[PDB]
Design a protein around this nucleic acid. Structure first.
Ligand SMILES: *CC[C@H](OP(*)(=O)O)[C@H](O)COP(=O)(O)O
Ligand code: NA
Ligand code: NA
Length: 324
DNA sequence: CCGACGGCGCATCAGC
DNA sequence: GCTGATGCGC
DNA sequence: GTCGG
């Protein structure tokens, strides 16, 4: 539906969501306002009253009253007052830096650090993650066109197999669901030597650094890498933006459940878990397990493919691109 | 009325 | 030195 | 902030 339908309302609710998350530190209100923004963005009518919006799930009495104020006045006094508070504005802005959440933003503004320039002058007060978030502030806010994601996928899948031909790597997220653009690249990796019962990530990260694909590290442990990458451009050509890449090393016996989980969408996964439950199975990120007659989860079932999960619960396979 | 609302993996701090 | 809490991103 | 036991 065209943004001109309810765009005023959905912008107001997104602004309130960001305020609750970044300033109030109220993650459950942030999610309530996001959920309300999302249901209203999908609604194929121009909302005429709060009462009409209130019929939608995730819209209750308070968001109805805000919509009535916005429809009558073209504004919300609560937001006009928030926009006049320079301290709220600074806290909200600093959370755009990866590694700066609501706590760090408030600590920074309370010691007079409010701008990107203030952060650059005070690098000693930033952790490693926040320094890299600052270094790539603009690039990290750019979307990744699908054509670039295809090129990135080709480097990652090929370089992983050069480390060891037995690795399996799958790019998940929006990209796997067939999105025309992505926020980041989320790679799930496994190897038959790694199961839930017994250097693998380090060697893959090392290879991707050696061919100058991975440029920086935000965090790295035994099973999760978060960092920065860049497509190679030909000499004299315009450089590609730096991109966020995550790499998750999953036990082989949990791998396809992970692929299903990190592919989504969220609504799809929720509908799939519910369907499994009525069929007598419980699905989480790691496993599919049969439920006994009193609701006790049994042993994990063997899963050798994503399709194996859909077969257990007798659902027809939804292609990754038919899950949003 | 009032608790749930995802929760893991990593970096870093608090406390011992 | 260690354990456990918190902040953070996804 | 909304939902639901
Ligand atoms: C927007 C109305 C609020 O809904 P939530 O419980 O955040 C409250 O009813 C009043 O909040 P105020 O806008 O701070 O007065
Ligand atoms: Na509603
Ligand atoms: Na941030």
């Amino acid at each position: 539906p065209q943004e001109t339908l309810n765009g005023g309302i959905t912008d107001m609710l997104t602004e309130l969501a960001n305020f609750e998350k970044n300033v109030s530190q109220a993650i459950h209100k942030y999610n309530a306002y996001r959920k309300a923004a999302s249901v209203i963005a999908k609604y194929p009518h121009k909302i005429k009253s709060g009462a009409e919006a209130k019929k939608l799930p995730g819209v209750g009495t308070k968001i109805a009253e805000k919509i009535d104020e916005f429809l009558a006045t073209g504004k919300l006094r609560k937001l006009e007052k928030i926009r006049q508070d320079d301290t709220s504005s600074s806290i909200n802005f600093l959370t755009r830096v990866s590694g700066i959440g609501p706590s760090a933003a408030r600590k920074f503004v309370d010691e007079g650090i409010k701008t990107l320039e203030d952060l650059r002058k005070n690098e000693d007060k930033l952790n490693h993650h926040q320094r890299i978030g600052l270094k790539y502030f603009g690039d990290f806010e750019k979307r990744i066109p699908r054509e670039e994601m295809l090129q990135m996928q080709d480097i990652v899948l090929n370089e992983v197999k050069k480390v060891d031909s037995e690795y399996i790597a799958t790019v998940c997220g929006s990209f796997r669901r067939g999105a025309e653009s992505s926020g980041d690249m989320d790679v799930l990796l496994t190897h038959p030597s790694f199961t839930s019962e017994s250097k693998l990530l380090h060697q893959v990260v090392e290879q991707l650094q050696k061919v100058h694909f991975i440029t920086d590290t935000l965090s790295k442990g035994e099973t999760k890498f978060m960092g920065v990458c860049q497509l190679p451009s030909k000499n004299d050509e315009k450089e590609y933006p730096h991109r966020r890449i995550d790499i998750r090393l999953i036990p082989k016996d949990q791998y396809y459940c992970g692929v299903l989980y990190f592919t989504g969408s969220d609504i799809f996964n929720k509908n799939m878990r519910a369907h499994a439950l009525e069929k007598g199975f419980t699905i989480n990120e790691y496993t599919i397990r049969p439920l006994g007659v009193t609701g006790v989860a049994g042993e994990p079932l063997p899963v050798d493919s994503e399709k194996d999960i859909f077969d257990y619960i007798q659902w027809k396979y939804r292609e990754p691109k038919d899950r949003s």
